[PDB]
Design a protein around this nucleic acid. Structure first.
Ligand SMILES: Cc1cn([C@H]2C[C@H](O)[C@@H](COP(=O)(O)OP(=O)(O)OP(=O)(O)O)O2)c(=O)[nH]c1=O
Ligand SMILES: [Mg+2]
Ligand SMILES: [Mg+2]
Length: 539
DNA sequence: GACCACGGCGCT
DNA sequence: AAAGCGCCGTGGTC
């Protein structure tokens, strides 16, 4: 029930391929095949074979499409059963799993993969039968978006290598001064990178009171938060906090990034994973460029390393208070929609409160602090943690939480409805109908249940913002190609583009408009836009 | 070398 | 009682 034919596969066939490694940009195409009707075609010389295809249909189409772009081809990605599955159940994140759940085994033979892609698409496509809403998301968002992600990955972003190279030597020296002090304070050297060794030193050798425990092993935590609480109990704590910062940045960004520069491009190429999140957001792997530093001074110094090619400019666009505007539209809370209809900003307002300064005195750093608070409280943070963090009394934190929700009466009602329906149906959905199954909504253990609920009511808000960003990327991409501009990165509610200096303004202008008008809501969407030679200056 | 579980921590 | 991610050392394998 599956014969073999000479390479030349008929049009519309599903491809199957094997890579030396999972990164499309660094991978060696080991094998390539195709499956159609009831037979399979294997290419004797894979690279040569790529030229024959007109489209990539099958598991991980975008990835082969990326490698294709890397070789000068324009093979756009088409149907991909992974996208259908992801839409049926966001827990379908890997081929291994999707193949086992929907009909087969993910092997290492290209032929078998092409055959697998075909039968999988057939079964999954049959399951979406009637799911008009998921069908809309597939054809109007996911499938086209895959093409967008391909170009983004293949294009990559420029990095100032010698800059980070020198930054490394500089920080290494500061790390040395910090570890050296810590050791003097402890009275003896030990591996500071080891949480276990630091536990003993802090809680046994020194007489510092433990503040909390780790989740799976119950050890006394040495988290930055636990360290905050002990900042004044001993001189060694501040030191460890700075060591933690520097080494985190150094080992995670400063040193690894310069070594990931592809030779044929001289740019960094990240993976944009389309089926890896339970809410519908994307993620970046290998170089995960969705978590590049930005808070601290050294963090900012690192972001300054992402630069535009000579003669071009980076254009950074970011939705304003994105998830709050979504909540207003989902909850229907008129007081909250009025906030936006009146051009207000909850982050600036919370910041004003936090630091005891008039709005107009809040800086971007203070406002950034307030966002974690606003979203922390919205999504479930406890009075206890809130009081701890802000460093205020329990009652003062308990009051803020009360006022917050009392101020937007409809939000809690919406939350409550999202859960009831979630309990009955077994899943929750976004504005466009993206679904996430949350069975634990009925666990008989409060601990597990309430955690399940927090995950449950957050999905529609985070997911909807995701649908929006993806939709916008799909509408924006073609407009950019015609203007000679390129899309480089996506950071959940942010886009980083690269445009020739003579068009950077028109591009910024166009992107902003495209994004703000993506899908009109009961509240306007505002996009902040910036232009500059490096990512930091862009925003 | 190649992986994994964890505690941590960078970003949204 | 914030949610969603991926990556880095440490320990401990294999
Ligand atoms: C920063 C942050 C954001 N989010 C979500 C909600 C929002 C979305 C995007 O993040 P941000 O862009 O940082 O926040 P924002 O869109 O609310 O506002 P702006 O950029 O204008 O400052 O991610 C959280 O759930 N937790 C967080 O800590
Ligand atoms: Mg934003
Ligand atoms: Mg953002």
């Amino acid at each position: 029930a599956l014969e073999e034919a000479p390479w030349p596969p008929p049009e519309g066939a599903f491809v199957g391929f094997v890579l030396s490694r999972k990164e499309p940009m660094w991978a060696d195409l080991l094998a390539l095949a195709a499956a159609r009707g009831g037979r399979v075609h294997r290419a004797p010389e894979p690279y040569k074979a790529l030229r024959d295809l007109k489209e990539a249909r099958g598991l991980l189409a975008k990835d082969l499409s990326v490698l294709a772009l890397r070789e000068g081809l324009g093979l756009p990605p088409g149907d991909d059963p992974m996208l259908l599955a992801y839409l049926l159940d966001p827990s379908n994140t890997t081929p291994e799993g999707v193949a086992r759940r929907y009909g087969g085994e993910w092997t290492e033979e290209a032929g078998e993969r092409a055959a697998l892609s075909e039968r999988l698409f057939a079964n999954l496509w049959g399951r979406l039968e009637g799911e008009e809403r998921l069908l809309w998301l597939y054809r109007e968002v996911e499938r086209p978006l895959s093409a967008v992600l391909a170009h983004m990955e293949a294009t990559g972003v420029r990095l100032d290598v010698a800059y980070l190279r020198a930054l490394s030597l500089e920080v290494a020296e500061e790390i040395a001064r910090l570890e050296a002090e810590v050791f003097r304070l402890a009275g003896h050297p030990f591996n500071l990178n080891s949480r276990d060794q630091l536990e003993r030193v802090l809680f046994d050798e020194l007489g510092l009171p433990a503040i909390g425990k780790t989740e799976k092993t119950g050890k006394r935590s040495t988290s930055a938060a636990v360290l905050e609480a002990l900042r004044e109990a001993h001189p060694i704590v501040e030191k460890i906090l700075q060591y933690r910062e520097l080494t985190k940045l150094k080992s995670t960004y400063i040193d690894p990034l310069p070594d990931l520069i592809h030779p044929r491009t001289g740019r960094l190429h990240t993976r944009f994973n389309q089926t890896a999140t339970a809410t519908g957001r994307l993620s970046s792997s290998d170089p995960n460029l969705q978590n590049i530093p930005v808070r601290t001074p050294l963090g900012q110094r690192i972001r300054r390393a992402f630069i535009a090619e000579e003669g071009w400019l980076l254009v950074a666009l970011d939705y304003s208070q994105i998830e709050l505007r979504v909540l207003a539209h989902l909850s229907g809370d008129e007081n909250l929609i009025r906030v936006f209809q009146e051009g207000r900003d909850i982050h600036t307002e919370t910041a004003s409160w936090m630091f005891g300064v008039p709005r107009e005195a809040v800086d971007p750093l203070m406002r950034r602090a307030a966002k974690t608070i606003n979203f922390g409280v919205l999504y479930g943070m406890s009075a206890h943690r809130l009081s701890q963090e802000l460093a205020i009394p329990y009652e003062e934190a308990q009051a803020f939480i009360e006022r917050y929700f009392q101020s937007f009466p409809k939000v809690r009602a919406w939350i409550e409805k999202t859960l009831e329906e979630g309990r009955r149906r077994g899943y929750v959905e976004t504005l466009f109908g993206r679904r996430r199954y949350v069975p634990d909504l009925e666990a008989r253990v409060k601990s597990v249940r309430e955690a399940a609920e927090r995950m449950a009511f957050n999905m529609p808000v985070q997911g909807t913002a995701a649908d929006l960003m993806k939709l916008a990327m799909v509408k924006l991409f073609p407009r950019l190609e015609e203007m000679g501009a390129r899309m480089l990165l996506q950071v959940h509610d942010e886009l980083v583009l690269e445009a020739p200096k003579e068009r950077a303004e028109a591009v910024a202008r166009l992107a902003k408009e495209v994004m703000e008008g993506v899908y009109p809501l009961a509240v306007p969407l505002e996009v902040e836009v910036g232009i500059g030679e490096d990512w930091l200056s862009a925003k």
